[PDB]
Amino acid sequence: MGNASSIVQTINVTGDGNVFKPSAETSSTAVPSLSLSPGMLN
């Protein structure tokens, strides 16, 4: 997961100042499931 940029880079993956701080409040979520029952969708 290396990186290299030319002239300039708005983000540096291997640079300094980044933060890795897992927390219960932040968690991590996506869209796993939705409510699509036939009767309720109509």
Binding site: S27, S28, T29, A30, V31, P32, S33, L34, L36, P38, G39, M40, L41, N42
Partner: protein, 633 residues
């Protein structure tokens, strides 16, 4: 909003004012009274003498309820034609016409209502709500046979296809239906209404208007059908979402924090409903079973004792070296069932047929291993007993004992357990009302049988045959041998741990379709721990393995776990004996499930598509046969 409507009794109104609001009743809003209702349904009588005039309370109706009751109305509206035939509910219910819109304070409590002033709040009365629900229920009660017959008509022949298109002459379909429908079907009596209803339900059944000569799709559920339909190169969204939802429910029930805690966990919290267990006491090993005691085979002087039952009758039994008993203490409430079916217990001077066997309970301070005389038995009681019968067996000149179901319940609270230096023992052997000569009967006991134990409580747990008030789940990992697990009690913590881990196994299998030696998002957590551990410093020769080998090992370990959940507690398991690996897997499963975004495996998708195409071909073939055997004019 929700709750009840309030009126201000005084001029002062603050968010915490004392005693400022009072309930709103029907008198304040006359048009919510039953006399002013919209009697289009006809429930309220037209006779003046039959209508009461009393005050009624008011409640607030929420948008969720409004929408759901409207959908309930549409449920009825799907079958208007048969309703017209039966002359029921000529006018639609229209739930929106029973509500009155008011501006007032809304809330469950006065304190909440004091801060919540809303406008155009729908309110209703319990009697009107009951009337509406009753009308809907009456119509649904009416439509019962029509619903059943319509479903039968739809399911008689294939009407849906998993993918693609199928076709068949409508005249042929109608002829087949006329041939195969039952005699009492309402569809025969009312064809047109059935046709209209099926045209509403299914978008593939289209009727031509004879006047204008046009055909057209007439379904009303296209939006739902679109979500139910499998798009090209993708399974249905409904199916994917439902599978993910079920997996998350399984993990939530499995409860990762409790099953992976590194700290003591209370027994009532950790315990789950148990299952009975089977044993044979005679063939057990005392060094491996900690709840058995035995007289040493050196006393060599059998002695006779007398016991009394609850009714007060007296029995005789003999105790010799090698006799086995169960240490009743430290095993929690339990139920014992003994079966002697199939055994022989036949001796030259002893005939088992017609004899009685019973359970005996002893209470004494003297330890069992030192018993050499009748004075040392303490208090003894016969709890239950049964007579025996003998029948010929497969072997010639051999008679075996018929099946038996001798039962007993050990409840410690019924016993006086205040004295610490007291011992409780359970014995099963021959009993008789007459003295038994030791030479005649030489069997130490009748424990050569089948014993079934069932836990009598779900708040106590045992470890290695002794009860513990507190359990550490993570420390049970890799601490059981197969023989120890076999000899474990029915309420051992290991069984509960296995049962809880089974849900995690099912969730992983539902979420995963990976083949042999293929990495998975549910398998990489073990790989990370292995990679860190192999670099960690310790004692012994260090072996360095690349990421490919580590991933293969992790995949094999995950597959072994899915195949058999007991490996986590089995001693010396290859990879699953490490609490770090177990905890990493338990934590990683939850994140892996929660990070999904309406996805399915590529292998699963392609297999599903191929199967659906095959089913479509089968349906087309069947319809071709139907058309061939029912020719159209």
């Amino acid at each position: 909003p929700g709750g009840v409507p309030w009126i201000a009794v005084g001029d002062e109104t603050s968010v915490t004012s004392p005693g400022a609001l009072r309930r709103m009743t029907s008198k304040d809003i006359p048009e919510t009274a039953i006399i002013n209702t919209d009697n289009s349904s006809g429930a309220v009588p037209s006779e003046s003498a039959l209508v009461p005039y009393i005050d009624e309370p008011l409640v607030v109706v929420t948008e969720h309820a409004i929408t759901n009751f409207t959908k309930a109305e549409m449920a009825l509206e799907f079958n208007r034609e048969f309703l017209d035939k039966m002359r029921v509910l000529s006018v639609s219910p229209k739930y929106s016409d029973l509500l009155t819109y008011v501006d007032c304070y809304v809330g469950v409590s006065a304190r909440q209502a004091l801060n919540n002033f809303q406008k155009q709040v729908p309110v209703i009365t319990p009697t009107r709500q009951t009337m509406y629900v009753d009308s809907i229920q009456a119509a649904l009660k009416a439509l019962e046979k029509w619903e059943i017959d319509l479903r039968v008509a739809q399911t008689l022949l294939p009407t849906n296809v998993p993918i693609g298109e199928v076709s068949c002459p409508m005249q042929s379909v109608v002829k087949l239906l006329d041939d195969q429908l039952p005699d009492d079907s309402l569809i025969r009596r009312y064809p047109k209404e059935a046709a209209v209803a099926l045209a509403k339900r299914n978008g593939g059944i289209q009727w031509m208007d004879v006047s204008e000569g046009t055909v057209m799709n007439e379904a009303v559920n296209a939006v739902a059908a679109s979500a139910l339909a499998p798009s090209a190169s993708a399974p249905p969204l409904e199916e994917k979402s439902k599978l993910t939802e079920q997996a998350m429910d399984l993990v939530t029930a499995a409860e990762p924090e409790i099953i992976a805690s590194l700290a003591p966990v209370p027994a009532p919290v950790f315990a789950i409903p148990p299952k009975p267990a089977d044993y044979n006491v005679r063939t057990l090993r005392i060094d491996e079973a900690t709840w058995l005691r035995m007289i040493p085979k050196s006393m060599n002087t059998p002695f006779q004792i007398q016991v009394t039952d609850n009714t007060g009758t007296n029995w005789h039994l003999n105790l010799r070296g090698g006799t086995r008993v169960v240490n009743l203490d430290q095993i929690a409430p339990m139920r014992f069932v003994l079966d002697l079916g199939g055994k022989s217990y036949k001796e030259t001077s002893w005939d088992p047929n017609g004899k009685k066997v019973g359970f005996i309970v002893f209470q004494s301070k003297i330890p069992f291993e030192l018993w050499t005389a009748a004075s040392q038995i303490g208090q003894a009681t016969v709890v239950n007993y049964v007579q025996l019968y003998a029948e010929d067996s497969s072997f010639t000149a051999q008679s075996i004992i018929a099946t038996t179901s001798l039962a007993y319940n050990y409840e410690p609270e019924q016993l006086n357990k205040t004295d610490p230096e007291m011992n409780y023992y359970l014995l099963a052997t021959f009993i008789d009302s007459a003295a038994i000569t030791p030479t005649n009967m030489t069997q130490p006991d009748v424990w050569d049988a089948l014993l079934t134990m069932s836990p009598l409580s779900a708040g106590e747990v045992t470890v290695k045959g002794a009860v513990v008030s507190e359990v550490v789940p993570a420390d049970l990992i890799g601490s059981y041998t197969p023989e120890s697990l076999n000899a474990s009690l029915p309420n051992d913590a290991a069984r509960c741990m296995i049962d809880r881990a089974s849900k995690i196994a099912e969730a992983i299998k539902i979420d995963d379709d990976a083949g042999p030696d293929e990495y998975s998002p549910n398998s990489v957590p073990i790989q990370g721990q292995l990679a860190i551990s192999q670099l960690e410093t310790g004692y012994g020769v260090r072996i360095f393995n690349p990421k490919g080998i580590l991933s293969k090992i992790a995949s094999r370990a995950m597959q072994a776990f899915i195949g058999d959940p007991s490996t986590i507690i089995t001693q010396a398991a290859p990879v699953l004996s490490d609490k770090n690996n177990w905890i990493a897997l338990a934590q990683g499963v939850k994140t892996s499930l929660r990070t999904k975004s309406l996805s399915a495996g590529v292998k699963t998708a392609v297999s599903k598509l191929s199967s659906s195409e095959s089913i479509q071909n089968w349906t087309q073939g069947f319809l071709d046969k139907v058309s061939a055997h029912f020719p159209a004019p």
